[PDB]
Design a protein around this ligand. Structure first.
Ligand code: HEM
Ligand code: HEM
Ligand code: HEM
Ligand code: HEM
Ligand code: XQU
Lengths: 141, 144, 141, 144
């Protein structure tokens, strides 16, 4: 479960991210495609080169969804229900990939948050992204 | 694999109806892990477990996949070279996340346990676990 | 989420296990030690030999906990609370190992339930063991 | 690893204070994945994040662990042989689940990202992911 401290840390960190959220989402995707190449199998129609506008646009969507999750951190299943449907029944991304994207989101945040990415905030953000991942895979079977 | 582990694999596999086990293993993959259906939109009715298991296109692909698996058991000392170009195919053209190979390997182990019962002993299982992990690793190896 | 059909399937299949629940727990543990030797690192001062009283006794404990879970399938967090405390705070078994024991329990059931282990029941048993695992790792952090 | 990957690894590691990064990576492992504290019962106060991170025994062990990691970066083509002795140690004496090596690898990547910021580019990360996977693989290799 996300504790009161976890939610505080997540809102603090994502608040410092602020309007860079979309850029950071694109960067996290780029990091994922290079570090974990099997994840590219879900984007065969994309140009995945560095600076790709398709990766930028998808990064914005991913980040906005996380912003919405943070804004609804007490009732995240409902906030994310449409995305849970989409991933469970159309995209059908194997659940193991969510840990890979979560790690790359954490690395991206770390690379941009010199003061904020304390050990405690790191722990909270990892729990938060695991919880988002759990919600997003909750309707798979 | 040890020599005894190799012997255990071959002796059990000589009793397998590859077409039947392949059809059932692929069917059970699509039932137990239904996101794996994403590759098979063209296969017709997958609406129920019975529909999946009865689906002729599912059975046909299961025969093909497990036939290749079966022929690969003659090359346990060279799985990577055996499956390199099939690895490339699954990456490049088919866009199959290699996690699917690991899920299918685990379903195959469950099918062998169900089919053979007590003959599928803990040591026979351990041997087959090395096999399905090795095939999955070989099929994933060319991914980039 | 466990569907009503999942609960029916799990109750019927584990009902057939009945008095063998202990024996099948022991066999599942042996399957896991042999197939996944890294799991032995959690049993360093333990007689792991085939047929040992300790593997039999632990297998019975595991099986009785699963019987408890099946009987309280609508409220597993409460039924397993002491056990989720124990694993999170003392045993501290890495969560990845629950998938390994779960697969080996599933294989043990497949090998002993010829009549019952249909594709649908296989799915239901897999979900149930994954749900038990989730409950047992829910307090880790 | 490729030549570009090895070059990226070596270039960044020239800037790494191994004692400091090692204490930071081990401390964060204990904070983020607190079940990993099971191996450090004699290390004193681990009760809060600040206590974990400030713990001298955590810092001292982190220096030892990342020192051996550092030594291995000179042998990137032979990680299995380089870490065989420590692999057997970690199995036979220390009883350490190799999953811990993978957790520490991803924490180290986060620490490098945090410390180096923009310099820890996506290609640099991808090279380090291959390294930490290879080191974990090597340290797990003698387990049986
Ligand atoms: C933090 C975890 C994740 C979040 C918040 C997220 C969110 C989203 C969002 C907001 C969309 C756009 C949906 C729409 O157009 O209405 C989307 C689509 C998509 N996502 Fe996920 N996602 C996550 C994880 C993943 C992972 C791990 C993968 C694969 C490795 C993946 C693959 C995709 C794909 C392929 C699409 C379709 C993109 C397109 O064709 O434009 N997602 N996701
Ligand atoms: C033991 C593991 C597997 C083996 C040995 C194997 C083998 C094969 C072979 C031999 C082909 C035919 C290639 C050709 O001649 O063009 C094929 C095609 C294919 N495989 Fe795999 N496969 C395995 C696992 C999987 C899994 C788990 C999936 C997805 C869940 C998958 C998806 C596909 C698809 C979608 C095709 C194209 C079929 C068609 O065009 O009709 N495979 N595979
Ligand atoms: C279905 C998943 C699991 C269930 C239901 C379960 C249940 C139990 C139970 C009932 C006990 C005895 C508690 C007591 O005596 O107070 C126990 C202890 C233990 N479990 Fe878990 N367990 C599970 C998974 C695991 C896994 C995956 C591991 C490691 C690979 C593990 C390692 C241990 C150990 C080392 C003990 C202590 C054994 C002893 O002291 O003799 N467990 N577990
Ligand atoms: C790159 C990964 C790792 C490397 C290279 C490494 C290397 C080492 C080295 C050099 C020692 C000192 C051996 C001696 O006494 O001569 C050691 C000890 C030890 N390591 Fe590892 N290690 C790694 C990861 C881990 C992890 C992740 C854990 C647990 C979470 C762990 C647990 C231990 C323990 C418990 C000891 C003995 C500590 C004591 O003295 O009380 N190691 N390791
Ligand atoms: O079966 C499940 N979902 C069904 C769709 O797959 C449907 O929404 C439903 C059916 C029955 C019940 N309650 O009897 C609740 C929801 C969950 Cl519970 Cl896994």
């Amino acid at each position: 479960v996300l504790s009161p401290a976890d939610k505080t840390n997540v809102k603090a960190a994502w608040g410092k991210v602020g309007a860079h959220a979309g850029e950071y989402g694109a960067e996290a995707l780029e990091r994922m495609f290079l570090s974990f190449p099997t994840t590219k199998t879900y984007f065969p129609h994309f140009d995945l080169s560095h600076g790709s506008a398709q990766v930028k646009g998808h990064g914005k969507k991913v980040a906005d969804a996380l912003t919405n999750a943070v804004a609804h951190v007490d009732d995240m299943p409902n906030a994310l229900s449409a995305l849970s449907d989409l991933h469970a029944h159309k995209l059908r991304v194997d659940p193991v990939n969510f840990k890979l994207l979560s790690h790359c989101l954490l690395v991206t945040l770390a690379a941009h948050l010199p003061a904020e990415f304390t050990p405690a905030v790191h722990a909270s953000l990892d729990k938060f992204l695991a919880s988002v991942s759990t919600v997003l895979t909750s309707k798979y079977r | 694999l040890t020599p005894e582990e190799k012997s255990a694999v071959t002796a059990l596999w000589g009793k397998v109806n590859v077409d039947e086990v392949g059809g059932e293993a692929l069917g059970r993959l699509l039932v137990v892990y239904p996101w794996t259906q994403r590759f098979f939109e063209s296969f017709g009715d997958l609406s129920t477990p019975d529909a999946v298991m009865g689906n002729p296109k599912v059975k046909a692909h299961g025969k093909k996949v497990l036939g290749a698996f079966s022929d690969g058991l003659a090359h346990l000392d060279n799985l990577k070279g055996t499956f390199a170009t099939l690895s490339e195919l699954h990456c490049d053209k088919l866009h199959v996340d290699p996690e699917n190979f690991r899920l299918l390997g685990n379903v195959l182990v469950c099918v062998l346990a169900h089919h053979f019962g007590k003959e599928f002993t803990p040591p026979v299982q351990a041997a087959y676990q090395k096999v399905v992990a090795g095939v999955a690793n070989a099929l994933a190896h060319k991914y980039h």
